[PDB]
Every structure is written in structure tokens, then in C-alpha cells.
């Protein structure tokens, strides 16, 4: 089952580490605004 | 990138074998030709020697054989219904040998009328009930026996008898 | 066109060939759907009419497009007007193809089916009645010749289909038609139910004189023993019942034969009563022609194994015929009875002696015993009577060989082997060896002591035996070595037992009956058949049966020495080295087998 | 590879090991490299007619040499077993037969003997259009063979027409030439064929001196009946 990758493996993979860096700016709308709008998502 | 060497694999006793040498082209392997329904597209690929292979990337036509009455007609392929190996090919309607497909019953229908003079002498005109139902529906089940990815052809034969019943239960 | 325009003539021939196919092809496909009434005359006048005159000679080999057109016209009632045109020229043309000497089977089959279809397809017009009469008369006159030409079983069947169609249609009403249909039928004899049904209709409806049906009666009498399935028998008995009705002489016999063969199960009280009837002077009354179906039935009952009363009575029923031969005042009328004894009973006795079943064999062994004991007019079994010593018991060998006590069987077979020299060669090969050889291959524990002495007895018997039969006896056993794995040991020992009688034949000539004067001819037979075949079997590498093939080497050292001294030097080295090649084998037990065999050889 | 050292050259050619750096490689042709004698070796080192490769080229270019009745101009043509070499200028005809030691011997033959050769039937099978044919040890494809001809039989081929004149079945008592192994070049009569299916079939052969030896079937070549060879032996 683990063989051939049929099972997800949660170990580190070195080549993919630090391929990209997160953007610290984040979403344009503030976190509280996003939380509010999801709570009302689709009524 | 695709290679056919057995060196990369693990041993029978099981030592993780080390790379002897760089990949050679005389164990070369090529990508899967995911044949699919539609306007014919075939590519010519140069193989070892002067031999040539045809890569049916797209095909909507095939020469399918009615083995019982011993004919073979060229018919449109409707789509893939069942493939024993993997269902994703059925979902993607990938065309490969042993794939169960739906084919044109019109030429077979006309041929039957011509040769037996009966809609669909009488004893010969009699055939299996399930295939009669398939013609009445207008869609015929068939199994591909040719390899579109090597010869560039999607030939096949009409399912009948035990094979037809088995695939019907599988469907 | 003149012969000069060769190219133009060739293309015209192609157009005629292609078009004539075109007429047949279109007319096969849409023959029934389209109405041709307007074009009946135009098609007939321009196509068929120019070619009717010669049509016989062209279409002899294989079916043609024009011929295929006529056949469909014959098949389909609506299209008979083609046949009606011009005094039935096309129908006459079809008959002319049949009448031709060089007509081949491929064209007969389609015609004869077409003629049958017309007979079966009545049509309400005057032309049809004339048509069927012409077809029937031409067909019936020539049927026996066509059958001989036929080479396909289906082609036989379609013929017989037409014959039954004739009976149902009622052309057999006429005497001449009846005679011709009989002449065709006896050719078929000279599927089966259809014959019997055809015979039943022609025979039941009409009286026949005894001379006409005597030959039919004898063959159909023989069909009793050949036939085994119940449907075959009941139909066969029904014919004999009717064979009785027409001719008062046979009414008694057919009445007997019917009560001999009763069905599904046989009526045991009645058949036994019939057996009491024949034994108590009824056998005296029966005439020579009466015996036949009684005999053929008797040979069937004795062949039976399930019911004890039937085979016992049947065996004694055969014994009544032997008494009937004795009752005959002299040899002349006895000879006519003896001829049947030689033709019918003796072949079926001999195969009966080779029958596997013991209870079945014992009846035949009883049958032969009575013949040897009573030999007033049948003298072929005189040699056996010498073995019998006037039929004295414990001396006859007939009671001992099938005795309940096995030691009595074994003591008797040695005595027979000792006295083989007095016995005549043909009897030794045809009757005696068949009765004893089954002991050799018997599998039971109880019969092995009998089997070993039987091998000695057969060896002595083969010593006093004919060259031609003795050859066939050898060749059969060599075939058994290859064909039968379980009987190899029994075969090889018996072959060694048959080597020695050939041996004691060959030293004094440099004994066997009718031995050839010249030693070269027997010598060659050994050089190309016996020595090679036995040697290659000996040299085969199958360690499972290596022990079983060792006595072959004894047979090899046998067959060589009486061959010429030059031949001796040729073959012993190959034989004896093979003995050595098994001697070198590591197995101690096998090596001991080589040592003793090499000793006996020595 | 494409170059051959003299030290690596086949032993049976008889070639001296110190003559030069390199030896002739037989070209592609009827016979295998290890079982062929190139015409350069045959003509220069056995016949001594030529003194180096250049006179060999001149001779072959004069078309004075015929192999199996046809002119050869290739210096390294692979002549082999049962090959007929004709030199019309010298009126000489040779057949290549191994000696007892296992080397080609330059055996002179008469014109009639040169007219025919013998080929062991390697294969019997029908080609296209249902035409039977036989493939011999020298690669000759001969169509319409006699039905009785089977594998391991020997066919007498007429060089002029390339047709089978006669044939010999493979059977005990037949006269046989050894074409491989330690017994190479020996002649003897068959005694027995030891059949190992799925393996190498072995044949026992007895010489005129009654000595017996065993050899694989692939090294067997029927050449005639005992005491009646179809060829003049060396």
C-alpha cells in the first residue's frame, strides 16, 4: 500500500523545502472582515 | 526519461543496486499514447531499425468484426463504457485494447436486412436476444482487439455470448 | 461473329458469363418479392430457349448460373411456368443432365433436391401433372446408376428423401413405378429408418411374390443381428410381419421372429415358450430359410449378458441347428445347411470367443464343444475331436477350461499344449488360442497360475501352427507392446513364447505348418521386421519398464541363430551389447536381472 | 568490432602467428567466420600462388577464381566446408575438407566432382505461396525439394543449376563426417542417435578401426553410405 505512493507520506522532502517564501502582506481584506463574510456565506 | 532497464530495481536477495552506467537508448521506453475519441490524429514514430510505428492520439473510427456472421464493417466509435484495467480511462474515455466501447450498429443493421431480408431464412436470421436489444436501442457493445498505440488502428469485435453476459454484469 | 474476331468473342463470352450470374444473383435475392408474370416469356425466350438444346452436355461438371436458375424455378411453386413452357424443355433439359453418363455428383445433388421439391409441392394445373410424371419416370429409371456415382453421405440422404417423397405422393400405386423404386432401393442396400419406412410403405401397401423378396428377406434377416437399438428392431420386425402377410410361406417365420423379438422389454414367458417350442421338435419342422432370422436372433441373445435364461436357451437353440444338420438324410441338403453354418455362425463364434465377458464366452465354448462332439457331416473340427478323445470328461478340455474349479482349468491347458501336434493348424489359430489368451492378460489374483501355464501352452500351440497365421499372431503382439502399456509384460513374455516355436521350426529345416521351403524368405522377414522392431524397443530408455523389456533380449537371441551364420554374426553383437549396456547399470537388482537373462541366453 | 589479431585468428587456418600484426577477417557470406577460409588465406598461405594480398587482389580481379562455379572478386570471401574452388587457368579444382587434425586441406578433385557439392539440410519449410524449400548448411534456399528430404539429411546440389540431384537420409550405418569438436575431421559410420529433446542430440560413430566416439548432432554431416562416399575423400 505504501509502495508506489498510493499512501500519503508525511515525511520531509528536501528538494521541495523553501522552494517559495510566503507573502507577508496576506489577503487584501482584513482577517476579521474575511471571518465575518464567511459566517454569512450563502446566508 | 522512461527506461526499460532492470538495473534500477531491487535484487532477488534484495540489495539496493548501485547505478552501473548512464541510461542507454536500446532499453528505451516511450510515453503512453492516450488515444481518445474524435477526429483522427495519428503520428509516425521512428523505431529501432527501419521499422515504423503509428501513434493514434485521436480516433473516432474502427473496423469492427461480427465474428458470428463473419463480417467486418467500418463504424463510428461512440465512447468507452468499461475498461478492465483502470476506470480512469473509462472516465477519460481513453482508447486502448480490451476497452469496451460502443460502436455504430447502422451498417451492421443494413447488412443484416440485405442478407436476410428481415428487420431487426428465419432460423438463420435468428440471433441472440441481447444483441437484438442492442440494435433496437441502436448502440452496439464491442471489445477492441487492435492496439491504436502501436498500429494506429482501433479494430475490434462485437461482444457475444458468455463474454457479452460477463461484461453486461460488470456494467 | 467469325473465329477471326477472337477478342470480340472472348468479351462476349465474359458478358454472357457475368450476366447469367447476374440473372441468378438477382433472382435468388428478390425471386419471391417481384412479379415476373410480364417478363416470364421474355426472359424464357431470349435466355433459356437458345441454350436448351445443348444444356445437357455443358453443365455436367459443376453447377452453373443457368443451371442454378432452373433449380430455383423447381424449388418455388410460383415459378413453375418456366418449366411448363414448350413441352417441358427446361425440365427435360434438367433430366438430360442426369441421364448423361459423365454427370458428376456435384450437379446431381442440386437436381435431385429440385426434383424432390417439385414432387412435394403440388400445383393445381394440368402442366404440373405432366411435369411430375416426366420427372418421376426419368428419375426412377436411372436412380441406381446415380447412387453408385454418389460419393457423399448427404448425397445418399437426399436421394432417399426423394424415394420417401415418391411413396407419400403415391406414384408407388403403379406396378412399374414400384418395381423401379425397389430396384433403386436394393442398390442402396447393395438414414436407416427412412429406408425402413420407405420399405414399410412399399411393402405394406402391396403384395410381392416370394422370388422378388427372397433376397430382401435374407439381407433384412441379417439386419437383426447388426441392429441393436430398439427403434431399429421394432421397425425391422414390422417389415418381417408384412413380409409374412404377402407370402403365406413366410407368415409362420415372421410370426416366430416377432415373438423372438418382443418390445420395451422382451416378453420372457413367451420367448421361453417359443424356445420350448423349437427344442421339442419345432427345430425339426423349421425349413432352411426359416432358420436364418431365428439364428441371427439367437446370435444376438447369446451375445447378451444380463438375462441367464436368454443366453442359455440361445446357446441350446444353436445346438438344435447342429442336430438339424444331423437329422438331414445325406450330405447334399446338409451341405446347404453347412454353408450357412460356415458363413454365419462360425465367424460370429470366433469373435465371440474373443469376447471379454466370461459368461458370454462360456456359452460359445459350449457351442463349439457340441459341434466337435457331433461331426456326422461337419468334418472341419475332426482335429478337436481327437483332443476330446470321444468327448470324454476331464479329457474334452471344454468342460475343464470353463470349470468352476480353477485347478481343473490349469491342469487341462497343459494337456492341450502337449497334444498340439495332433491338432490341425487352422483350428489352433482360429479357435483355441482365442479361448486361452485372455488368461494371459487376466488381471485377477486367481488366474495368474493359469496365465503362466497358458503362455507355455500357446508357445507349444504356435509351434504346431501355420506360417501365415503365426506371423499375424506375432505382428499383433508387437503392436500390443507399443499400444498397450499395461499388457507389455504379458506381451513380451508371450513374444518370447512365440520366438521359440519359430526357433524349433528353423533348425531342422536348416514343426511349423506350411513352412516355406526356402530359408531366405523367413530370414528376411526377421531381418527387416523382427530384429529391428524388437531391438529398438529394447534400446528405449524408460527406466520404469526396463525390467519388463529384458525378456526381449532372449527373443532377440532366439530369432537370430537360425538365420544364416552371416546374419548371426550381424545381429548378436548389437543385441548382446545392449544386454551389456543394461549390465553396466548401477542398480544391483537390475544387474541380477541381466545376469539371469544373459544366462538363459547363454 | 572490425579488426582481428593474428593471435586471435582461428587456429584451423594454419596461419603462422608471427607473419604480421593482423589477419584477414572473412567477409559476410555463406559460412560463419569461425568456420570459413577466406580466399586470401587459401590462395596465398595454402596454395602459395600469391605472395601478398596485392597479388591476391590481382588474381581475383582477373576473374581466374570461381567459388561454387561463380566468379568471386572479394579478397575475404568466406569459402567453407564442401565449397568447390575452380582455377581454369591452372585447370585445377579443389574441395575444402578438414583433415584429421581439423584444418582445411586443399584436396584436388576431378571436373565431375567439382560439378556438384553436398549440403546438409539445416531446415525444411514452405515459403510464400505454399512453395516448399530447403535451407542447407551453406545458406542455399532450394525450392520444390523432394518430399522425403528432412532435416539432418544431405542433398547433392548441381552447381550449374543449383538443383538437388540426389539425397541421403540420416540413419544408422550411414557414413559421416565430423564438422566440429575434438573429433573434428574424423570419418565414421553411425551407430546410434541419442535423442535428448530440449537438449543437444548426441550421435555415436564407429570408425573403420572399430573405435567409437560420441559427438553432438550439430557437428554431423552425412557424406554417403559405409564404403561408398559420394565425394573423393582426402
Amino acid at each position: 500500500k505504501a509502495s508506489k505512493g498510493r499512501k500519503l507520506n508525511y515525511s520531509v522532502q528536501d528538494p521541495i523545502a523553501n522552494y517559495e517564501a510566503p507573502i507577508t502582506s496576506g489577503y487584501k481584506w482584513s482577517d476579521d472582515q474575511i471571518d465575518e463574510f464567511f459566517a454569512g456565506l450563502l446566508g | 526519461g522512461i527506461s526499460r532497464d532492470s538495473r534500477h530495481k531491487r535484487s532477488a536477495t534484495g540489495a539496493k543496486r548501485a547505478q552501473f552506467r548512464k541510461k542507454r537508448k536500446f532499453e528505451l521506453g516511450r510515453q503512453p499514447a492516450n488515444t481518445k475519441i474524435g477526429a483522427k490524429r495519428i503520428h509516425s514514430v521512428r523505431t529501432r531499425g527501419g521499422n515504423k510505428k503509428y501513434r493514434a492520439l485521436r480516433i473516432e473510427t474502427g473496423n469492427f468484426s461480427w465474428a458470428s456472421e463473419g463480417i467486418s464493417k467500418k463504424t463510428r466509435i461512440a465512447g468507452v463504457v468499461y475498461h478492465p484495467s483502470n476506470n480512469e480511462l473509462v472516465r477519460t474515455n481513453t482508447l486502448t485494447k480490451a476497452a469496451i466501447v460502443q460502436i455504430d450498429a447502422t451498417p451492421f443493421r443494413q447488412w443484416f436486412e440485405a442478407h436476410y431480408g428481415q428487420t431487426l431464412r428465419a432460423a438463420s436470421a435468428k440471433i441472440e436476444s441481447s444483441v437484438e436489444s442492442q440494435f433496437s436501442a441502436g448502440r452496439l457493445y464491442a471489445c477492441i482487439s487492435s492496439r491504436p498505440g502501436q498500429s494506429g488502428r482501433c479494430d475490434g469485435y462485437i461482444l457475444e455470448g458468455e463474454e457479452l453476459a460477463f461484461y453486461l454484469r460488470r456494467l | 461473329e467469325s473465329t477471326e474476331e477472337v477478342h470480340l468473342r472472348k468479351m462476349a463470352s465474359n458478358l454472357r458469363q457475368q450476366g447469367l450470374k447476374c440473372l441468378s444473383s438477382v433472382f435468388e435475392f428478390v425471386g419471391n418479392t417481384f412479379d415476373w408474370s410480364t417478363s416470364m416469356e421474355d426472359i424464357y425466350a431470349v435466355v433459356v430457349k437458345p441454350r436448351i438444346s445443348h444444356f445437357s452436355d455443358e453443365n455436367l461438371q459443376q453447377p452453373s448460373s443457368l443451371l442454378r436458375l432452373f433449380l430455383y424455378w423447381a424449388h418455388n411453386p410460383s415459378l413453375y411456368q418456366f418449366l411448363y413452357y414448350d413441352e417441358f424443355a427446361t425440365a427435360t433439359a434438367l433430366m438430360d443432365t442426369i441421364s448423361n453418363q459423365h454427370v458428376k455428383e456435384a450437379v446431381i445433388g442440386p437436381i435431385i433436391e429440385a426434383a424432390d421439391s417439385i414432387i412435394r409441392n403440388p400445383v393445381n394445373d394440368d402442366h404440373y401433372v405432366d411435369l411430375v410424371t416426366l420427372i418421376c419416370t426419368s428419375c426412377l429409371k436411372i436412380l441406381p446408376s446415380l447412387y453408385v456415382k454418389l460419393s457423399d453421405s448427404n448425397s445418399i440422404s437426399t436421394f432417399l428423401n426423394l424415394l420417401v417423397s415418391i411413396t407419400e405422393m403415391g406414384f408407388i400405386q403403379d406396378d412399374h413405378v414400384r418395381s423401379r423404386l425397389i430396384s433403386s432401393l436394393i442398390s442402396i442396400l447393395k438414414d436407416t429408418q427412412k429406408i425402413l419406412k420407405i420399405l414399410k410403405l412399399i411393402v405394406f401397401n402391396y403384395n410381392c411374390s416370394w422370388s422378388d423378396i427372397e433376397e430382401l428377406y435374407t439381407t433384412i434377416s441379417s439386419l437383426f443381428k447388426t441392429f441393436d437399438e430398439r427403434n431399429l428392431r421394432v421397425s425391422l420386425t414390422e417389415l418381417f410381419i408384412e413380409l409374412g402377410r404377402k407370402v403365406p410361406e413366410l407368415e409362420s417365420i415372421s410370426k416366430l421372429v416377432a415373438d423372438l423379438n418382443s418390445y420395451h422389454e422382451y416378453d420372457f414367458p413367451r420367448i421361453l415358450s417359443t424356445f420350448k417350442g423349437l427344442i421339442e421338435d419345432g427345430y425339426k419342422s423349421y425349413s432352411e430359410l426359416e432358420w436364418l432370422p431365428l439364428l441371427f436372433t439367437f446370435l444376438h441373445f447369446i451375445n447378451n449378458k444380463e438375462e441367464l435364461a436368454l443366453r442359455t436357451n440361445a446357446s441350446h437353440a444353436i445346438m438344435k441347428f447342429i442336430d438339424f444338420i444331423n437329422e438331414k438324410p445325406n450330405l447334399n441338403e446338409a451341405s446347404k445347411s453347412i454353408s450357412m453354418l460356415k458363413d454365419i455362425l462360425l465367424p460370429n463364434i470366433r469373435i465371440g470367443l474373443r469376447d471379454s465377458l466370461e459368461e458370454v464366452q462360456s456359452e460359445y465354448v459350449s457351442v463349439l464343444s457340441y459341434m466337435v462332439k457331433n461331426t456326422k457331416y461337419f468334418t472341419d473340427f475332426e482335429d478337436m475331436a481327437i483332443l476330446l478323445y470321444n468327448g470324454d470328461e476331464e479329457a474334452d478340455f471344454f468342460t475343464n477350461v470353463n470349470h468352476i474349479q480353477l485347478h481343473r482349468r490349469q491342469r487341462a491347458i497343459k494337456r492341450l499344449g502337449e497334444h498340439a501336434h495332433q491338432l490341425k493348424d487352422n483350428s489352433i489359430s482360429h479357435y483355441l488360442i482365442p479361448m486361452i489368451e485372455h488368461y494371459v492378460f487376466s488381471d485377477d489374483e486367481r488366474y495368474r497360475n493359469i496365465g503362466n501355464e497358458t503362455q507355455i501352452a500357446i508357445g507349444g500351440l504356435a509351434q504346431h501352427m501355420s506360417w501365415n497365421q503365426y506371423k499375424a499372431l506375432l505382428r499383433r503382439y508387437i503392436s500390443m507392446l507399443k499400444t498397450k502399456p499395461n499388457q507389455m509384460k504379458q506381451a513380451v513374455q508371450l513374444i518370447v513364447q512365440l520366438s521359440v516355436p519359430l526357433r524349433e521350426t528353423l533348425r531342422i529345416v536348416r514343426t511349423l505348418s506350411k513352412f516355406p521351403s526356402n530359408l531366405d524368405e523367413p530370414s528376411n522377414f526377421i531381418k527387416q521386421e523382427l530384429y529391428p522392431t524388437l531391438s529398438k524397443i529394447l534400446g528405449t530408455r524408460d527406466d520404469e519398464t526396463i525390467i519388463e523389456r529384458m525378456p526381449i533380449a532372449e527373443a532377440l537371441v532366439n530369432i537370430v541363430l537360425g538365420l544364416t551364420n552371416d546374419d548371426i554374426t550381424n545381429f548378436l553383437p548389437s543385441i548382446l551389447t545392449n544386454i551389456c549396456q543394461v549390465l553396466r547399470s548401477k542398480s544391483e537388482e537390475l544387474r541380477d536381472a541381466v545376469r539371469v537373462t544373459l544366462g538363459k541366453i547363454s | 568490432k572490425k579488426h582481428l589479431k593474428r593471435l586471435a585468428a582461428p587456429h584451423h587456418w594454419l596461419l603462422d602467428k608471427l607473419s604480421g600484426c593482423y589477419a584477414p577477417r572473412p567477409s559476410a557470406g555463406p559460412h560463419k567466420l569461425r568456420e570459413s577460409l577466406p580466399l586470401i588465406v587459401f590462395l596465398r598461405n595454402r596454395l602459395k600462388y600469391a605472395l601478398n594480398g596485392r597479388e591476391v587482389k590481382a588474381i581475383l580481379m582477373q576473374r581466374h577464381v570461381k567459388v561454387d562455379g561463380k566468379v568471386r572478386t572479394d579478397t575475404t570471401y568466406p569459402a567453407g566446408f564442401m565449397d568447390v574452388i575452380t582455377l581454369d587457368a591452372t585447370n585445377e579444382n579443389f574441395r575444402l575438407v578438414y583433415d584429421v587434425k581439423g584444418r582445411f586441406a586443399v584436396h584436388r578433385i576431378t571436373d565431375e566432382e567439382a560439378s556438384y557439392k553436398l549440403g546438409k539440410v539445416k531446415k525444411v519449410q514452405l515459403g510464400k505461396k505454399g512453395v516448399p524449400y530447403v535451407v542447407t548448411h551453406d545458406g542455399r534456399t532450394i525450392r520444390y525439394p523432394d518430399p522425403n528430404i528432412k532435416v539432418n539429411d544431405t542433398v547433392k546440389i548441381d552447381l550449374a543449376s543449383g538443383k538437388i540431384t540426389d539425397f541421403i537420409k540420416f540413419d544408422a550405418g550411414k557414413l559421416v563426417y565430423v564438422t566440429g569438436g575434438r573429433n573434428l575431421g574424423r570419418i565414421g559410420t553411425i551407430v546410434h542417435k541419442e535423442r535428448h529433446d530440449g537438449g543437444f542430440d548426441l550421435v555415436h560413430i564407429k570408425d573403420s578401426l572399430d573405435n567409437t566416439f560420441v559427438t553432438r548432432l550439430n557437428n554431423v554431416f552425412v557424406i554417403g553410405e559405409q564404403g561408398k562416399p559420394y565425394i573423393s575423400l582426402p
Binding site: - | A67, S68, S85, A98, I127, Y167, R170 | - | D197, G198
Partner: protein
């Protein structure tokens, strides 16, 4: 027989539904030679096995070996063990060794753990299987 997603059938062997001459489906079989009797269960069996020496597209050629069955747990193949006495010249003495060979077994043969099987070499069937069972005892 039909325990797989695909339909199992002998390639190029046809049973005509219309003709229906015989109830039994037409079965193709061959004798492997080498004096190995083709078993009757293979002749009248209903299994489909592409690697069977009598009904599959595999030919027995080359070495013929014998061994003792050691494992029969996997599908249509087994593991056999062959032992021998190897010679050591320095001590001039023999030592026992063994080797395990995986061999294909057709369903026409019933093999347990401990019996003796004679096997025939054939083309590469799998990563490790080069042989095929041809006689059981």
C-alpha cells in the same frame, strides 16, 4: 474462472454462439513433449492460464530440473528448494548447500509442501520465475 475484471479466454479460440453444436466451449491444448503426459484435467478443464505449459502460450525448452516444494502460498507459482554437495579442494571435502527457485505452476497441477516436482525452463514469466511445473509426484 471469471474472477477478474477482464474476461478470461484462450486467444484466437472461438465458440460460435449461433452454431451451438456442443455445450462445452472449444478448448485448445498442446502436449509439451519430453515424454510429459498432458493431464486430462488440463484437456477438459475450464481454467484460463496464459502461462500454462499445456494450454498457455509458453514453450518448455532448455534445462529440466527437479526439486522439493517449500512454499505454495502465492497464486499460480511456488518456491522449490534444490540441494547439493559442493566440493572444497583445499580440504578435499564436501559441504551441503541449497538454493530456492520460484517456478510457475499451472492450476492443472495440485502441489503441496513437501512433494517432488520436475520443472521445465521457459521464457521469463515474471521478475524471478524462469521455469514451469511439468510433472508432480
Amino acid at each position: 474462472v471469471q474472477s477478474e475484471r477482464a474476461f478470461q479466454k484462450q486467444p484466437h479460440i472461438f465458440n460460435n454462439p449461433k452454431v451451438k453444436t456442443s455445450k462445452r466451449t472449444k478448448r485448445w491444448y498442446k502436449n509439451a513433449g519430453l515424454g510429459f503426459k498432458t493431464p486430462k484435467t488440463a484437456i477438459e478443464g475450464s481454467y484460463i492460464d496464459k502461462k500454462c505449459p499445456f494450454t498457455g502460450l509458453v514453450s518448455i525448452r532448455g534445462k529440466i530440473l527437479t526439486g522439493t516444494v517449500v512454499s505454495t502460498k502465492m497464486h499460480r507459482t511456488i518456491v522449490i528448494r534444490r540441494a547439493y554437495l559442493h566440493y572444497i579442494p583445499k580440504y578435499n571435502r564436501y559441504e551441503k548447500r541449497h538454493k530456492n527457485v520460484p517456478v510457475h505452476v499451472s492450476p492443472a497441477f495440485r502441489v503441496q509442501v513437501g512433494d517432488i516436482v520436475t520443472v521445465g525452463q521457459c521464457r521469463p514469466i515474471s521478475k524471478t520465475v524462469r521455469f514451469n511445473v511439468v510433472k508432480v509426484s
